Amino acid sequence: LTPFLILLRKTLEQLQEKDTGNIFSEPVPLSEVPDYLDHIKKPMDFFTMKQNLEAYRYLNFDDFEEDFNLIVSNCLKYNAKDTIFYRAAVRLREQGGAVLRQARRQAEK
Ligand SMILES: COc1ccccc1C(=O)Nc1cc2c(cc1N1CCNC[C@H]1C)n(C)c(=O)n2C
Numbered sequence: 311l312t313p314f315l316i317l318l319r320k321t322l323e324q325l326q327e328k329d330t331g332n333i334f335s336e337p338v339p340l341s342e343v344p345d346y347l348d349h350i351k352k353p354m355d356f357f358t359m360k361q362n363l364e365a366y367r368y369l370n371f372d373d374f375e376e377d378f379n380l381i382v383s384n385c386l387k388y389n390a391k392d393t394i395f396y397r398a399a400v401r402l403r404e405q406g407g408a409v410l411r412q413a414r415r416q417a418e419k
Contacts, residue, residue: 329398
């Protein structure tokens, strides 16, 4: 499934391009944010997702979109509304939605 993996890789880069601050580029570093696991049960970030993609752990679009969504939702859930992080997650949901919709469309032809 390289036709599919070509699409996901491009789609992942497109999503990651929307992260203009590199807020979601690597995991929330748990040593630096020791209460993060108290609120967030399933952390996610673009580096992890790249590893999963390249390790063949995303069979279908849904399992890929799942992780992307965790990135957004974790961030909305952990950070106060009046934070740059929360605002970045609001943006990324809006902007990633379009990328994801077009990519699902491209899959179908
Ligand atoms: C690599 O990040 C750090 C390095 C040194 C000290 C602290 C951090 C850190 O806490 N970064 C961080 C925390 C986040 C966070 C993102 C970061 N980082 C900002 C800088 N880029 C790396 C990214 C993981 N998000 C989205 C979030 O909800 N939280 C709590």
